């Protein structure tokens, strides 16, 4: 029928995208401009060890004020830490088991936790009394939800299984803005500081940048051939680092529509499991799923430093909103703060 003609049209359109990218592919000044001094040797110290978890810590997420992070440990418990005093502000018992994503609200008055139960639990951090009560059990996900970030206090997307990312109206509780088009279980979900474009990394190894109003795949970055684990936007919203099961972290850029830079070690076989940018975005903190994390220069791809000291893999990284310290939600059931 019409499959062949549309297949050929898509082929030529994709080739046009490829030609536009390669034509506008100039030499990346970054490695060329090594006359700019390197980041040298900077090694952070663990100022605080947040040893308040027994189960493995899956997701950590700093708050909007960068003092109240939320961590989820796999047994099913959320701990909102106070990182300045190592005292738990809350410890939420979650009905969900196998929680992989916890997200802090822009207001800092809600937390979104997602497990394999296919329910995005939206817990109110503060109710009128003062206890922690579930605001909304967002149900209606085809698969499990892998990651999620609040667009608003009644808007949130949920990078879920079965190729969906639909934005949910929290007030009504039904999915509102569909984001289908992926071909793998959409694991990652990164919001730009502009919050009008979110890039989602799935098991198809293609990072799909979606426009959050119209709801179609604004850009479709490719270059990974292994499932994308974590995506971290640059503090400007023009570029993002992407990690995967390969030891290569790809710094992609929206302007060039293609990868600018690589951070790869042939001496490391561990998959890049977490990516994070510092306050300036000059440091690329490479979370490795062996037992420890590294940090590269996001403009030279040399060894900025290594944060080791965990006896089990660092499953997630987080950076303060002033970039002044980095917390490592690891699988040794500790959240270590490195200043």
């Amino acid at each position: 029928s019409e499959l062949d003609q549309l297949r050929q049209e898509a082929e030529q359109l994709k080739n046009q995208i490829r030609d536009a990218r390669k034509a506008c592919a100039d030499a990346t000044l970054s490695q060329i401009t090594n006359n700019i001094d390197p980041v040298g040797r900077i090694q952070m110290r663990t100022r605080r060890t947040l040893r308040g978890h027994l189960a493995k810590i899956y997701a950590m997420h700093w708050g909007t004020d960068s003092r109240l992070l939320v961590s989820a440990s796999q047994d099913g418990k959320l701990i909102i830490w106070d990182s300045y005093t190592t005292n738990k502000v809350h410890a939420i018992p979650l009905r969900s088991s196998w929680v992989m994503t916890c997200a802090y609200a822009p207001s800092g008055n809600y937390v979104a936790c997602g497990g394999l139960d296919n329910i995005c639990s939206i817990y109110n951090l503060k109710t009128r009394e003062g206890n922690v009560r579930v605001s909304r059990e967002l149900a209606g996900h085809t698969g499990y939800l892998s990651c999620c970030r609040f667009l608003d206090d009644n808007q949130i997307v949920t990078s879920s299984g079965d190729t969906t990312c639909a934005l949910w109206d929290i007030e009504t509780g039904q999915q509102t803005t569909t984001f289908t088009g992926h071909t793998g279980d959409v694991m990652s979900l990164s919001l730009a500081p502009d919050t009008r474009l979110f890039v989602s990394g799935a098991c198809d190894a293609s990072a799909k940048l979606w426009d959050v109003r119209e709801g179609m795949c604004r850009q479709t970055f490719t270059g990974h051939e292994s499932d994308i684990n974590a995506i971290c936007f640059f503090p400007n919203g023009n570029a993002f680092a992407t990690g995967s099961d390969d030891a290569t972290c790809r710094l992609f850029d929206l302007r060039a529509d293609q990868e600018l830079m690589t951070y790869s070690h042939d001496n490391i076989i561990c998959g890049i499991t977490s990516v994070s940018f510092s306050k300036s975005g000059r440091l690329l903190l490479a979370g490795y799923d062996d037992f420890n994390c590294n940090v590269w220069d996001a403009l030279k791809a040399d060894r900025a430093g290594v944060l080791a000291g965990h006896d089990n893999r660092v499953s997630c990284l987080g950076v303060t909103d002033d970039g002044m310290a980095v917390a490592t939600g690891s699988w040794d059931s500790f959240l270590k703060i490195w200043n």
């Binding site: 029928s1 019409e2 499959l3 549309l6 297949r7 049209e9 898509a10 359109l13 046009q16 995208i17 536009a20 990218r21 034509a23 506008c24 592919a25 100039d26 030499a27 990346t28 000044l29 970054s30 700019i36 980041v39 900077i42 100022r47 605080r48 003092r67 990182s83 300045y84 088009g181 179609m216 795949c217 604004r218 850009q219 479709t220 640059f234 503090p235 400007n236 023009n238 570029a239 850029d253 302007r255 060039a256 529509d257 293609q258 600018l260 510092s278 306050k279 300036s280 975005g281 000059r282 440091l283 996001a298 403009l299 002033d322 970039g323 002044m324 310290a325 980095v326 703060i337 200043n339």
Partner: protein
């Protein structure tokens, strides 16, 4: 429609449409984006506390 191999046409149609404006959108040189990133990073290197030895008093992590 379901006689064209059970609605397989719609996905290809959507792919073509979504490739259209991706072809249309502005393209920028790699060197320009790289230089922009260096400019922002160097301008903010001082105010990124990782790059600078933090004194014993200012941070809530040596407080």
């Amino acid at each position: 429609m379901a006689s064209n191999n059970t609605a397989s046409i719609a996905q290809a149609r959507k792919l073509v449409e979504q490739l259209k404006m991706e072809a249309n959108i502005d393209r920028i040189k790699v060197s320009k984006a790289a230089a922009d990133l260096m400019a922002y990073c160097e301008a903010h290197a001082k105010e990124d506390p990782l790059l600078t030895p933090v004194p014993a008093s200012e941070n809530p992590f040596r407080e």
